[PDB]
């Protein structure tokens, strides 16, 4: 396990949603259409918590990383704005220790792996992140100590990914949405360029259903999977102990809500309104419309 | 068919709806027994109807201010066509234009009387 | 008038989604799920919401059809006393003496 | 013109498809289990991905109740689900009327 | 002991089905189906709908399926309801003629001795003319029928009134 | 206007002779077959009808 012998928390930064976290409800195909549907949503317009990890060289060089345990409540919008991969997964549970079974879903570099498990946790869960100087290659290791009374487990169709750390704007978004009804943990996402300093771009954008586990499981809280490298983010430099490449994540809680959503020929939803916005959407709603006349 | 005659009931009553239709139109457009052309020569005093006779270049003899008017506006159930069509309707407001602007109102009570338009 | 027809007749199509108290707003489920006897009593569930549906559409189209009635009427009358003849009527054909 | 009668293109004959599944439901690790639980703690299995044959289950005379409710228990080897729960426990024969 | 089965239908496409077997696939023909459990009677066509790669069923306006995908070969089809119309037959009356022309309402001629295409649906037994007459039967979309001759039913296209300059 | 009123009459009469799902059309018949508990969820159809 890692052993970070010092870490500085800051208080929850907040930032708008606009109008983002809509995702497919169902398996079925629509177009050009107008269709009103009731399910888990983020609200438009909600404040989402904003969270980082940085490192600050310097005479006072300072590392952060939050990665604190967070409220799941009935379902999660999680987004990552990142210039190189140092989100990496995410454990679900109640207790997250050894006493009650929990969810861990981890992108290990080749493979996302799911399990659930009676897991002993590390006190602080990261994956540590290094490079092995005579394979030539990245390693990842570290999320728990033992494992026990497992239920479920699945592991992706392989994938290459890249582990160096990169300077600049964060150039990735990636959006996904969890939630864990009758039984199911689903699993809604999208990935999109960027070009940003900070904050979650304005502008609509739709989920695909990513996967729909039958874990059973009951989950009130969730935690963050962070990589930790041991060395350097580049080649050539001269540091000592862990670092974090630069990464965003914004977290918003899913509601009961009303969404009209609108899909072109193509079947793509390209628009939506959310019905307990403001007076106007419930108009829009009311109409089965986006254009609404004089009256 | 334990509820007997309510289908038979439902399905008169909207074929009573559908008769009234192709009746209501009968009433409004086919009040001239006679067809009547505008002449060739369009010598209407000063007076001009282009836009409201027919215009032949067309598919259809609508007038201009018709084709305006005409942009603006599997569970076991169906449409059924009216019996005129839009085309019929046009050929009766055609003559009902040229019998007024050629008659004034005689066509309205017998045969239809030339007048200069002028005049009329 | 086209507006009324269409939202008549969607209301009349989405309407047979609509359970009525039935296991399924689907017959085939109803005939596909169950025997004789506990198909027929979720059937006559869906035929009484059905006929209600149909009943209710059948009734606002004769309404309906009576004020298209009148203004066709009206609009035959205008054809005779306004195209086919000078009406004195104030009003009756537009605004200022006809 | 009168309206007579209605038309219909009646179908000339029946498709079947489903998937290219083999493996039978795992029915007899349910109903054949050793041992049950205390009913407090009663003891679910979801069932997924198989075909179920539950005109093995209708066919066998050891059942004293075989009670369907939103399904006529002939008809389910002609039916399909997204999933199933199995649900075992065990209870006094009087009380078997509260489930 | 005690064994609770308790069941979802259809949302998702169904894991657990019964020991039924699959047919053959037939397409541009009138057919009962069964995909999934979710059964129907219907014509089956090959869709150009773009359907992604989670989506397993297209439905209508109207909230009615009007495309599926195959469970074992994963393209789409296209669900066309088996056709159906009004029949209405025209007739001279008894007192003149014992002869009928019928009408199917909004039904092309290949879906059904004279055979003509209105556009009120396929028309049989009437004798079409290239002339025009006063409506005598009403058809619809311009057509009338009446009885002419040596008789038969005709099939014409009304005249408004006579032409006059 | 005479024939669409006698029409609707004849509707109306011919609609008595309808079970609308109890045992029978005719009441009497029901009330001579059933004691009282069992012919009112008989007679609550043909009133609904």
């Known amino acids: 396990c890692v052993n970070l012998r010092t870490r500085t928390q800051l208080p929850p930064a907040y930032t708008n949603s606009f109008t983002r976290g809509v995702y497919y409800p ?80 981890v992108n290990n570099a080749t493979n996302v792996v799911i399990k659930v498990c009676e897991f002993q946790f590390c006190n602080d869960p990261f994956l540590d992140v290094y490079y092995h100087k ?86 009130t809280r969730f935690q963050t999977l962070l990589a930790l490298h041991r060395s350097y983010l580049t080649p050539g430099d001269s540091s000592s102990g862990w670092t974090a490449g630069a990464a965003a994540y914004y977290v918003g809680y899913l509601q009961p809500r009303t969404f009209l959503l609108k899909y072109n020929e193509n079947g793509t939803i390209t628009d939506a309104v959310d019905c307990a916005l403001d007076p106007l959407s419930e108009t829009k709603c009311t109409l089965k419309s986006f254009t609404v006349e004089k009256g | 068919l334990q509820y007997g005659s309510f289908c038979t009931q439902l399905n008169r009553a909207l074929t009573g709806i559908a008769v009234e239709q192709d009746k209501n139109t009968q009433e409004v457009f086919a009040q001239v027994k006679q067809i009547y052309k505008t002449p060739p020569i369009k010598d209407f005093g000063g007076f001009n109807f282009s836009q409201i006779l027919p215009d032949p270049s067309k598919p259809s003899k609508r007038s201009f201010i018709e084709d305006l008017l005409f942009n603006k506006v599997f569970n076991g159930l169906t ?42 | 008038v086209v507006n009324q027809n269409a939202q008549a007749l969607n209301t009349l199509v989405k309407q047979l989604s609509s359970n009525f108290g039935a296991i399924s707003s689907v017959l085939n489920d109803i005939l596909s799920r169950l025997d004789k006897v506990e198909a027929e009593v979720q059937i006559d569930r869906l035929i009484t919401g059905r006929l209600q549906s149909l009943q209710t559409y059948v009734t606002q189209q004769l309404i309906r059809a009576a004020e298209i009635r009148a203004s066709a009427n009206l609009a035959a009358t205008k054809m005779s006393e306004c195209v086919l003849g000078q009406s004195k009527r104030v009003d009756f054909c537009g605004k200022g003496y006809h | 013109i009168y309206q007579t009668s209605n038309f219909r293109v009646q179908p000339t004959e029946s498709i079947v498809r489903f998937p290219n599944i083999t493996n039978l439901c795992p029915f007899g690790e349910v109903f054949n289990a050793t041992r049950f639980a205390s009913v407090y703690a009663w003891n679910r ?29 002939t008809k389910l080897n002609d039916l399909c689900f997204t999933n199933v729960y199995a649900d075992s426990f065990v209870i006094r024969g009087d009380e078997v009327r509260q489930i | 002991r005690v064994v609770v089965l308790s069941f979802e239908l259809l949302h ?12 053959n696939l037939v397409k541009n023909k009138c057919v009962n189906f069964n995909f999934n459990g979710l059964t129907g009677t ?71 001795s004279n055979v003509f295409q209105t556009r009120a649906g396929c028309l049989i037994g009437a004798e079409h003319v290239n002339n025009s007459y006063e409506c005598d039967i009403p058809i619809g979309a311009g057509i009338c029928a009446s009885y002419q001759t040596s008789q038969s039913i005709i099939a014409y296209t009304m005249s408004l009134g006579a032409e006059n300059s």
């Open chain 1, 26 to 105: 169902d398996k079925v195909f629509r177009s050009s259409v107008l269709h009103s549907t009731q399910d888990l949503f983020l609200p438009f317009f909600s404040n989402v918590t904003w969270f980082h990890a940085i490192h600050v060289s310097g005479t006072n060089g300072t590392k952060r990383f939050d990665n604190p345990v967070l409220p799941f409540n009935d379902g999660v919008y999680f987004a990552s704005t990142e210039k190189s991969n140092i989100i990496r997964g995410w454990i679900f549970g109640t207790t997250l220790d050894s006493k009650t079974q929990s969810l861990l879903i």
């Open chain 1, 134 to 219: 005579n394979n030539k290659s990245w390693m990842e290791s570290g999320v728990y100590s033992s494992a026990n009374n497992c239920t479920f487990e699945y592991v992706s169709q392989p994938f290459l990914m890249d582990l160096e750390g990169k300077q600049g704007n964060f150039k990735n978004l990636r959006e996904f949405v969890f939630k864990n009804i009758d039984g199911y943990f689903k699993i809604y996402s999208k990935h999109t360029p960027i070009n940003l300093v900070r904050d979650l771009p304005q502008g609509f954008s739709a989920l695909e259903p990513l996967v729909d586990l039958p874990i059973g499981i009951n989950i």
């Open chain 2, 79 to 120: 449409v059924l066509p009216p019996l005129l069509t839009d085309e019929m309707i046009a050929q009766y407001t055609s003559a009902l234009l040229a019998g007024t602007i050629t008659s004034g109102w005689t066509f309205g009570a017998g045969a239809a009387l030339q007048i200069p338009f002028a005049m009329q």
């Open chain 4, 45 to 73: 299995k979801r069932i997924s991905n198989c075909v179920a044959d539950y005109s093995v289950l209708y066919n066998s005379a050891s059942f004293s109740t075989f009670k369907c409710y939103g399904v006529s228990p």
């Open chain 5, 12 to 23: 998702a496409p169904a894991t657990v089905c019964g020991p039924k077997k699959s047919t």
């Open chain 5, 42 to 112: 219907g014509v089956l066509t090959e869709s150009n709908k773009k359907f992604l790669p989670f989506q397993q069923f297209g439905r209508d306006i109207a909230d009615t399926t009007d495309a599926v995908r195959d469970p074992q070969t994963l393209e789409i089809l296209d669900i066309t309801p088996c056709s159906f119309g009004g029949v209405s037959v025209i007739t001279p009356g008894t007192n003149t003629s014992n002869q009928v022309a019928v009408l199917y309402q909004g039904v092309n001629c290949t879906e059904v």
